Amino acid sequence: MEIEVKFRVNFEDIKRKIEGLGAKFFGIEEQEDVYFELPSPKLLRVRKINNTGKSYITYKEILDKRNEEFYELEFEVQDPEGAIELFKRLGFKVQGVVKKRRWIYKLNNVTFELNRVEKAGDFLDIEVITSNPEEGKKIIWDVARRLGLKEEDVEPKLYIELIN
Amino acid sequence: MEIEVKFRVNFEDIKRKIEGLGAKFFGIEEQEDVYFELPSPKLLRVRKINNTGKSYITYKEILDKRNEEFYELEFEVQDPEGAIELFKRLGFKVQGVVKKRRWIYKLNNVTFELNRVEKAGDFLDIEVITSNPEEGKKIIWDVARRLGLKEEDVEPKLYIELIN
Ligand SMILES: [Cl-]
Ligand SMILES: [Cl-]
Ligand SMILES: [Cl-]
Ligand SMILES: [Cl-]
Ligand SMILES: [Cl-]
Numbered sequence A, B: 001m002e003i004e005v006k007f008r009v010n011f012e013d014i015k016r017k018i019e020g021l022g023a024k025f026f027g028i029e030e031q032e033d034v035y036f037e038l039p040s041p042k043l044l045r046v047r048k049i050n051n052t053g054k055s056y057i058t059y060k061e062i063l064d065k066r067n068e069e070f071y072e073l074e075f076e077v078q079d080p081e082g083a084i085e086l087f088k089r090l091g092f093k094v095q096g097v098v099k100k101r102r103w104i105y106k107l108n109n110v111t112f113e114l115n116r117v118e119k120a121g122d123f124l125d126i127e128v129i130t131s132n133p134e135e136g137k138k139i140i141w142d143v144a145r146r147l148g149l150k151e152e153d154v155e156p157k158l159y160i161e162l163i164n
Helices: A011-021 A080-089 A133-146 B011-020 B080-089 B133-146
Strands: A002-008 A024-036 A042-049 A054-062 A069-076 A094-107 A110-117 A121-128 B002-008 B024-036 B042-049 B054-062 B069-076 B094-107 B110-117 B121-128
Touching: A002 A133, A011 A094, A011 A110, A011 A121, A042 A080, A054 A080, A054 B080, A069 B080, A080 B054, A080 B069, A110 A133, A121 A133, B002 B133, B011 B094, B011 B110, B011 B121, B042 B080, B054 B080, B110 B133, B121 B133
Parallel strands: none
Antiparallel strands: A002 A069, A002 A121, A024 A042, A024 A094, A042 A054, A054 A069, A094 A110, A110 A121, B002 B069, B002 B121, B024 B042, B024 B094, B042 B054, B054 B069, B094 B110, B110 B121
């Protein structure tokens, strides 16, 4: 399952720390997500990565109450406009649009997603790949503390809930 | 608008006639369509073309009572299994699965789709591209008659309704 913790951060400072850690810079993604309202605790969105030409349909189901564990179903599509039209024609309503510029860094089984989110602010998502959720969260927190982050820095809300 | 008329035919005979007309053979597609139940008169399916490695999500809205006029929204996806899983998780129920081998031929603005449909039989769809629905049907019928087809040969039912 998807395991991740989100932190409210100062972009410049944390970028410097992540790099000082030796994380490998993967790339920047300029994303635009169109969300469709589903019953709790499910999420549905069509994502367009404007600088890479990639588009995806993504479905998520929150598995915990801290918004740290998710089941994710994601696949690439060749027509994001068509995907958005499809969900509207199926009766789904647009929940909102999240636009962000994401800096991706990798360190072993940990992925850092440093996001500059339009109308929300700057956030860092620390993601880990693991078969055991508990061990995964332990890894995320060891990394977080190495970056000088604490529990008070955590942001439980989803990006679609954070945009003003 | 998609305009097409479907005919019940004898595969070998009509294939001969179509080639006799000088239609250009485009290719054969081994298709597997998984349909999801929508309220009338809408259709939703995920198609896999097993021999070409292509997959699509297709939505249609029947616009007439003879099932000859359709609004179609179709786009390529990279994961048909995921698309099928997605619709199931969104609450849609599988309506059925249509499997067929399609021979595609082209002649000007007309496309011939000769289908050998599992558990249904052999059918020929004659489609035309037009801005004027009526002129389109006129073109289809001139071609149909050139192939020796008549009104009694028409099959109005959709493939998802035809499979046993
Ligand atoms: Cl994400
Ligand atoms: Cl989020
Ligand atoms: Cl996100
Ligand atoms: Cl078709
Ligand atoms: Cl079809």
